[PDB]
Amino acid sequence: VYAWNRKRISNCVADYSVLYNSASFSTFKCYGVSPTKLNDLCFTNVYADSFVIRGDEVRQIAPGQTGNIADYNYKLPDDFTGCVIAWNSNNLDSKVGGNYNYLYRLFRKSNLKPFERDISTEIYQAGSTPCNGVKGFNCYFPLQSYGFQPTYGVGYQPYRVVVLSFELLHAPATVCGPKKSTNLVKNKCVNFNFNGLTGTGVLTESNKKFLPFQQFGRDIADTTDAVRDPQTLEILDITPCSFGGVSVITPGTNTSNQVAVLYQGVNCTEVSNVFQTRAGCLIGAEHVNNSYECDIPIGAGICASYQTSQSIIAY
Amino acid sequence: EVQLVQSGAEVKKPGSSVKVSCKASGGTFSSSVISWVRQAPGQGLEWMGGIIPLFGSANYAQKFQGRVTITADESTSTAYMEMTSLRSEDTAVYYCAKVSQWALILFWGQGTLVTVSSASTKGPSVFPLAPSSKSTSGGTAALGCLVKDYFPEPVTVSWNSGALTSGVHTFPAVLQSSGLYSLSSVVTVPSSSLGTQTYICNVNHKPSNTKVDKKVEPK
Amino acid sequence: EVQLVQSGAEVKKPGSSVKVSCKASGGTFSSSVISWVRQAPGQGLEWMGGIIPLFGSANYAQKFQGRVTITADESTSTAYMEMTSLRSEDTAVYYCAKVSQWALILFWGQGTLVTVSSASTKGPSVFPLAPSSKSTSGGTAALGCLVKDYFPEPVTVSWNSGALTSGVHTFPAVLQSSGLYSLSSVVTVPSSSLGTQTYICNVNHKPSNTKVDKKVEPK
Amino acid sequence: TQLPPAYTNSFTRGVYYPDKVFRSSVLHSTQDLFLPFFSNVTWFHANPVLPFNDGVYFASTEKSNIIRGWIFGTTLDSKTQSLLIVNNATNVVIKVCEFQFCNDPFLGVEFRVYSSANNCTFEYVSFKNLREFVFKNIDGYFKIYSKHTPINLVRGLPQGFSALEPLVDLPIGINITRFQTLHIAYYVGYLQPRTFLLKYNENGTITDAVDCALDPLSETKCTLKSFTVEKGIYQTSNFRVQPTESIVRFPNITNLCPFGEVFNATRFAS
Amino acid sequence: AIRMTQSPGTLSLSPGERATLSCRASQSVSSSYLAWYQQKPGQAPRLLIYGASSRATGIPDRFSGSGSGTDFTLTISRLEPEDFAVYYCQQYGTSPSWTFGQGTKVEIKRTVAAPSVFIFPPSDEQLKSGTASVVCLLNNFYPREAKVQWKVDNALQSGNSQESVTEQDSKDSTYSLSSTLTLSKADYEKHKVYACEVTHQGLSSPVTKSFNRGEC
Ligand SMILES: *[C@@H]1O[C@H](CO)[C@@H](O[C@@H]2O[C@H](CO)[C@@H](O)[C@H](O)[C@H]2NC(C)=O)[C@H](O)[C@H]1NC(C)=O
Ligand SMILES: *[C@@H]1O[C@H](CO)[C@@H](O)[C@H](O)[C@H]1NC(C)=O
Ligand SMILES: *[C@@H]1O[C@H](CO)[C@@H](O)[C@H](O)[C@H]1NC(C)=O
Ligand SMILES: *[C@@H]1O[C@H](CO)[C@@H](O)[C@H](O)[C@H]1NC(C)=O
Ligand SMILES: *[C@@H]1O[C@H](CO)[C@@H](O)[C@H](O)[C@H]1NC(C)=O
Ligand SMILES: *[C@@H]1O[C@H](CO)[C@@H](O)[C@H](O)[C@H]1NC(C)=O
Ligand SMILES: *[C@@H]1O[C@H](CO)[C@@H](O)[C@H](O)[C@H]1NC(C)=O
Ligand SMILES: *[C@@H]1O[C@H](CO)[C@@H](O)[C@H](O)[C@H]1NC(C)=O
């Protein structure tokens, strides 16, 4: 644990179904992400940090913990995104005569910063007497052996811990789930998914001059306005599909049950009589070349009224 | 958990193509590397090729680069190895090994025995080897039976319906140029009992359902 | 756990001063009562004075009001006891005990001997005691060796290189008015063995590195 | 021996892209470790053991790529991991071994930098030119930004604006407090937690920036989120007299709390 | 492609000794993807070690793998009658590119045994089929390495002899070799003397047994 190993996983695809469906783990706790979502997500990198502790210390491998393990051996940051997985390894790390291979730092001069490793074996100075590399009084060897034995209790048996840190940076994603990518469909309202970033909208070819290190652009509201296609490295603009209010133009139900409908601010192609106003698309109203007083206001100088065989007209 | 089961053993005439299957269980098929390993009789293991079902891009050894085609099917979790233009040297056991990306261990199938023979089922031919009355090795003689021209394997050879077991050396069969197997089974007995004890070799060939009990006598 | 370690033994001439230190490990030093306890040779334990390092106000026993100064340094976690104008009566073992405010248990040091004497290192003088030829106690006569005018302690007395152990009594040393320790070591043997068995007392004084082997004979 | 130091005005140099998100035609406010405008950069000729602090802006006006690498660490005496970078042109030899650096490491025209290299937990391999760099170490990850521009001036840094792209991010997980340069006129400014108001144009280039703590006018510009300020009076910040020292006043108590007889009693009650 | 070569080709030891097999990789092979298989004759390969150091399920603790880089070693601390089989080292990975070692066989170390040479004239009923087979038997010899040649009328014969070798018997630890010389009936009658010469370590001089065609 004091010299925890870190492997870098990059440029690969992992099916995490085999992971969270495994019964070999006693602890499986994800932070910032769900275990079942990992197959739908892509990450810039993954860091698999592996080590051994004892059972009573597994709780210390978690964001916002304190103790010997957390303070002196392995500290997870508060904004940690990842998954901590621990499983009992009594059959592997316990010897009858005592397994002294595994050590943990028992004293340190301060706390470790997140994802910081200390392998120094300098003799710890517990007081004001310098040790000069020799044990004695107020001088300790900073590392203490676990000495796992098969007869130990559950809280002292050895547990193997792997922490998977999923880096979600702005760089191109290189670790993904086993999700097959469909073809790119443009000019249509679709539900899209780029490197695990999901959304709904219309994708169009863009003239934005992305720099090589940029993978997406954001708007003022912090919404992804453009993306780089991970396979054919082209920039795509993402726009909301089409939306707007729907107004019903009616004479009194005493007068008639016939109504017209205004789709506000929508072209007469996203949606009898269809009339393109500056207020939107008007359906069910007969446009007339005559001009009368405003009866029901539509907007932009356009008003609607029920007139003579009788129908709703716009003018 | 994980378990691989291959198709049944095959007997194919030369010039045809075989397609051995390998059905995997445990739900680790897509994210695994599944390879085919060929062992010719009496020879070490040989790696033919492999494939990752997620990607579907099979890789083969240069020796088997062209003659073999390996495919994977996730929807049914099955790997297929197809060998075309079978030859006499292709008679071998084909295993399918599997390595998950979450484990360093390897999972093996039970093996698929493929026999590339142009002949058909045939009963054994038994010829006794009459011991020589003068070529005695210090008072001990050897006598046996030569089983020849039989197919397919295996055949069981016993002495006096299993009464005699000591000194019996049933040599392993060999594939002759004619496509029919042959072996020699001998036993060592004292030379003084050549004219006293009667020895009969019993040969059983279940595929041909042939039983032959032939007596050995001094020349 | 909590451990107290004192300075080494001290030898001081009368009129000088000594300062015994006591280092504590365990982090309980600041919030404890550290006290000094003096045991003169052959006398009971005697509480000199104590101090709470967190406050720094020492409290001494009425007998040690003026001649003792007790201090504590939290930065080094060390308690010092300084005695000035050392007298011959101050030759004693000084322990440092400690009581934390979180426990009722006591933590003691290993004890530091402070010897206040004027005489310097000196070799021993051995004088045998000739057993009386007529004052026999029922056939048993006692004989021994008197080791006198030696300093500092200790000395080891053996008989016949340790061959004689039963009936041997090595009396404890006593401090003479001259500052030199002295003792007598005796042993009782049958009177019939006075003229038969030869007895030699070996006296060793390591600080002076002096060994004397003296034979005892009847007068 | 080593040449004496020197000082220069940094003008507006030292700006880098805080992130890789594309933005165009916008004024974006970012709090990050930046080189303050018109700062006092140390100028050296060709290399002592400079500190690191919160991060280092580096600059080198070269024509033959003399300066090649750097060293990072705390003691740099093989008692702790030290990050050695040999980033020259396009070849990088990054290592984090427990190097035992020599008294005066140098590179010949020959590779004699460290005497020992054990327990390498990481190893990564891949008119004048002004090469500008930004180095920092946050959360165990070492970030490096860079930008190389052709300039024609040797007296001092050019009076103009140019942005630094992000290049490298290493998982060293090392404590860095000191650093040094490796050779075969360079400037060393220090980064501080400054707020900047960057201007992205139609092509996404940061063509201008305002240092929000340089002067009251820049504070006004950042408060208004605009590079142009009209005539008027604008409330830009708040003023507070910061405390000078800390005072503790506890009662004059001379007794220890008898917690021993509670936590160390022979028999606790029912 | 990476080539895995084992050593020694054949290991001869006695039960209770220490067996050490080595595996050389032409390139730097990750130690995480090295496996050791044990194959007894007539059985599918049995995995012993994976990861170059991990014992599989039910593997006795006397088996132990180690090594790195280009050298990987299997160390059977105490051989047992069950620990005599052909051992392979496999280099594999998470990519479809694996290789195997040529195989190392561990056999019983026994005193040299003198072969017993027998020659059997072909049976008449077999001659009735037009094929004549001459059997030369080397019974209870050790080590396996032996040379057998067919001399017909003092003429060396090649391309017409087939040899079968039995496994090392668990009782006497001696091998057996059967050499069969198959010829046509017409060619069989063209010669009178048929002999097989045996050269072996346990024989001071080559031993040849011969028979005359048609003799009793
Ligand atoms: C990184 O290393 C520096 C230098 O060794 C550490 O700063 C020292 O901190 C100790 C106490 O923590 C002080 O006694 C020293 O005076 C400091 N040295 C200097 C040069 O300032 C720093 O604490 C280390 N950081 C971490 C997180 O361990
Ligand atoms: C409908 O309106 C007309 C006049 O606008 C009115 O006369 C009539 O009563 C109304 N109908 C009802 C049901 O109130
Ligand atoms: C609606 O779309 C068509 C073509 O898509 C366009 O010609 C027309 O101008 C649009 N409507 C308005 C009001 O511009
Ligand atoms: C209005 O008149 C114009 C002729 O200028 C004609 O094109 C148009 O169709 C007329 N509008 C309607 C609603 O008939
Ligand atoms: C930089 O600081 C030095 C002293 O530290 C000072 O002499 C020099 O004038 C400063 N330079 C500028 C441009 O302020
Ligand atoms: C490297 O680290 C190991 C433990 O992590 C330690 O035993 C060894 O001494 C270190 N290397 C050196 C050269 O000290
Ligand atoms: C963006 O690039 C084009 C390419 O020619 C150029 O014309 C234009 O001026 C650039 N934008 C700005 C703001 O300079
Ligand atoms: C605290 O009390 C002590 C006596 O117990 C006295 O000597 C000291 O002067 C006092 N300090 C203050 C600040 O009152």
Same domain, B36 and B94: yes
Tell me which ligand sits closest to the C-alpha of residue A3.
6
Same domain, B134 and B111: no
D24 close to ligand 5 (CB < 6 Angstrom) = no
Q: Which residues of B touch A13 (CB under 8 A)?
A: 31, 54
Task: Find tokens 């007997």 and name the residue.
Answer: B11
Buried/exposed D69-91: b ≥16 CB within 10 Å, e otherwise: bbbbbeebebebbbbbbbbbeee
Answer whether D173 sits within 8 Å of A6, measured CB to CB: yes
DSSP per position, E132-143:
EEEEEEEEEEBS
DSSP 3-state of E69:
coil
d(CA A228, CA A249): 44
Domain end, chosen from C86, C116, C146, is at C116
Cα(D150) to ligand 7 centroid in Å equals: 20
Count how many domains chain C has. Answer: 2
d(CA D201, CA D207): 7
Residues 6+ apart with CB under 8 A from B185: B144, B145, B147, B157, B168, B169, B170, B171, B201
The domain that holds B209 is classified in CATH as 2.60.40.10
Distance of CA C97 to the CA centre of its chain: 19
DSSP state of B161: G
Mind spelling out the 3-state secondary structure of chain C?
CCEEEECCCEEECCCCCEEEEEEEECCCCCCEEEEEEEECCCCCEEEEEEECCCCCCCEECHHHCCCEEEEEECCCCEEEEEECCCCHHHCEEEEEEEEECCCCCCEECCCEEEEECCCCCECCEEEEECCCCCCCECCEEEEEEEEEEEECCCCEEEECCCCECCCEEECCCEECCCCCEEEEEEEEEEHHHCCCCCEEEEEEECCCCEEEEEEECCC
Number of other CB atoms surrounding residue D194 within 10 Å: 18
CA-closest residue to ligand 1 atom 4 = D74
Provide the token pair at E192.
């009178």
DSSP 3-state of A43:
strand
d(CA D135, CA D150): 21
Distance (Å) from the C-alpha of residue A190 to the closest C-alpha of chain D?
Answer: 23
Domain end, chosen from B98, B116, B134, is at B116
A81 burial type by CB count under 10 A (0-12 exposed, 13-18 middle, 19+ buried): middle
Answer whether A127 sits within 8 Å of C76, measured CB to CB: yes
Distance of CA A189 to the CA centre of its chain: 23
Cα(A257) to ligand 2 centroid in Å equals: 14
Tell me which ligand sits closest to the C-alpha of residue A256.
2
D177 close to ligand 1 (CB < 6 Angstrom) = yes
DSSP per position, D5-46:
-EEEE-TT--EE-SSS-B--SEEEEEEEEE--TT-EEEEE--
Q: Which residues of C touch A129 (CB under 8 A)?
A: 23, 76
Would an 8 Å CB–CB cutoff place C26 in contact with chain A?
no
Q: Which of D208, D213, D215 is nearest to D195 (CA)?
A: D213
d(CA A256, CA A248): 13
Phi, psi dihedrals of residue A128, rounded to the nearest 5°: -100, 10
Of A108, A109, A110, A111, best ligand 1 pocket probe by most atoms within 8 Å of the beta carbon:
A110
Last residue before each break in chain D (C–N > 2.5 Å): 46, 109, 126, 184
Number of other CB atoms surrounding residue C163 within 10 Å: 9
> Top-level CATH class of D6-240?
mainly beta
DSSP per position, D84-148:
EE--BTTB-EEE-----EEEEEE-----EEES-------EEE--EEEEEEEEEEETTEEEEEEEE
**Shortest CB distance from D256 goes to which of C101, C104, C105?**
C101
Same domain, C18 and C78: yes
Q: Which of A264, A266, A263, A282 is nearest to A274 (CA)?
A: A282
DSSP per position, B177-202:
TTS-EEEEEEEEEEGGGTTTS-EEEE
The H or E element that residue A100 is part of is none
Same domain, B160 and B193: yes
D238 close to ligand 7 (CB < 6 Angstrom) = no
Would an 8 Å CB–CB cutoff place B202 in contact with chain A?
no
Answer whether A18 sits within 8 Å of B54, measured CB to CB: no
Q: Are strands A286-287 and D40-44 parallel, antiparallel or unpaired?
A: unpaired
Q: Which residues of D touch A214 (CB under 8 A)?
A: 20-22, 204
DSSP 3-state of D52:
coil
Same domain, B94 and B138: no
Residues 6+ apart with CB under 8 A from D61: D128, D129, D130, D151, D154, D185, D186
Reported in sequence order, the residue ranges of chain B that DSSP labels E, i.e. its strands, are 3-6, 10-12, 18-25, 32-39, 45-51, 59-60, 68-73, 78-83, 92-100, 106-108, 112-116, 125-129, 140-150, 156-159, 168-170, 174-175, 181-190, 199-205, 210-216
Sequence ranges of the domains in chain E? 4-108, 116-212
Contact C/B (≥3 CB pairs under 8 Å): no
Atom of ligand 4 nearest to the CA of A286: 13
Q: How many Cα neighbours within 13 Å face the side chain of A30?
A: 13
d(CA D129, CA B124): 90
Q: How far apart are the first and last CA of chain A?
A: 80
Distance (Å) of CA C145 to CA C170, C197, C211: 10, 16, 14
Distance (Å) from the C-alpha of residue D186 to the closest C-alpha of chain A?
Answer: 27
Hey, which residues 95-114 in chain B have their CB within 8 Å of chain E?
A: 95, 97, 99, 101, 104-106, 108, 110-111
d(CA D63, CA D31): 34
D177 close to ligand 5 (CB < 6 Angstrom) = no
Atom of ligand 7 nearest to the CA of D203: 1
Same domain, B134 and B96: no
Four-way CATH pick for E4-108: 3.30.479.30, 2.60.40.10, 1.10.3720.10, 2.60.40.420: 2.60.40.10
Q: How many Cα neighbours within 13 Å face the side chain of B24?
A: 29
Distance (Å) from the C-alpha of residue C102 to the closest C-alpha of chain D?
Answer: 4
Last residue before each break in chain B (C–N > 2.5 Å): none
Domain E116-212: assigned CATH number: 2.60.40.10
DSSP state of B164: B
Q: Which residues of C touch D265 (CB under 8 A)?
A: 104
What is chain A's length? 315
Provide the token pair at D143.
């970030």
Would an 8 Å CB–CB cutoff place C102 in contact with chain D?
yes
Provide the token pair at B134.
């003068």
d(CA E109, CA E173): 8
Task: Find tokens 């009194």 and name the residue.
Answer: A252
Answer whether D80 sits within 8 Å of A220, measured CB to CB: no
Of A121, A141, A145, best ligand 6 pocket probe by most atoms within 8 Å of the beta carbon:
A121
Same domain, B43 and B140: no
Of D249, D250, D252, best ligand 8 pocket probe by most atoms within 8 Å of the beta carbon:
D252
Phi, psi dihedrals of residue B42, rounded to the nearest 5°: 75, 15
d(CA D76, CA C3): 36
Max CA pair span of chain C: 72
Number of other CB atoms surrounding residue D134 within 10 Å: 24
Atom of ligand 5 nearest to the CA of D9: 13
d(CA E23, CA E39): 16
Distance (Å) of CA A271 to CA A242, A266, B156: 10, 8, 83
DSSP state of A57: G
Same domain, B69 and B170: no
CA-closest residue to ligand 4 atom 5 = A289
Residues 6+ apart with CB under 8 A from D270: none
**Shortest CB distance from C5 goes to which of A126, A128, A137?**
A137
Same domain, C110 and C12: yes
DSSP state of A15: -
Number of other CB atoms surrounding residue D66 within 10 Å: 15
Atom of ligand 3 nearest to the CA of A276: 13
Q: Are strands C78-83 and C18-25 parallel, antiparallel or unpaired?
A: antiparallel
Q: Which of C153, C183, C167, C150 is nearest to C91 (CA)?
A: C153
Hey, which residues 179-208 in chain D have their CB within 8 Å of chain A?
A: 203-204
d(CA D6, CA D25): 39
Same domain, C8 and C105: yes
Cα(A253) to ligand 2 centroid in Å equals: 10
DSSP 3-state of B134:
coil
Answer whether A8 sits within 8 Å of D204, measured CB to CB: no
CA-closest residue to ligand 7 atom 7 = D203
Query: What sign for the dihedral angle of Cα D168, D172, D173, D175?
Result: negative
Identify the residue among D259, D261, D267, D268 best suited for mutation to test binding to C, counting C beta carbons within 10 A and taking the highest: D259
List the domain range (segments joined by +) for residue C156: 125-216
Number of other CB atoms surrounding residue E98 within 10 Å: 28
Last residue before each break in chain E (C–N > 2.5 Å): none
Same domain, C131 and C149: yes
Identify the residue among B6, B52, B106, B183 best suited for mutation to test binding to E, counting E beta carbons within 10 A and taking the highest: B106
Neighbours of chain E (3+ CB pairs under 8 A): B
Fold matches, E4-108 and E116-212:
yes
Atom of ligand 7 nearest to the CA of D207: 13
Same domain, B106 and B139: no
Is the Cβ–Cβ distance between D49 and D73 less than 8 Å? no
The H or E element that residue A8 is part of is strand A5-9
Q: Which of B114, B28, B124 is nearest to B79 (CA)?
A: B28
Is the Cβ–Cβ distance between C45 and C61 less than 8 Å? no
d(CA C24, CA E47): 59
d(CA E114, CA B170): 20
Domain end, chosen from C116, C143, C173, is at C116
DSSP 3-state of D206:
strand
Q: Which residues of D touch C102 (CB under 8 A)?
A: 259-260, 263-264
Q: Which of B122, B168, B130 is nearest to B148 (CA)?
A: B122
Is the Cβ–Cβ distance between A179 and A96 less than 8 Å? no
Q: Which of A198, A167, A233, A163 is nearest to A11 (CA)?
A: A167
Distance (Å) of CA A101 to CA A145, A286, D5, E56, E63: 7, 89, 51, 22, 21
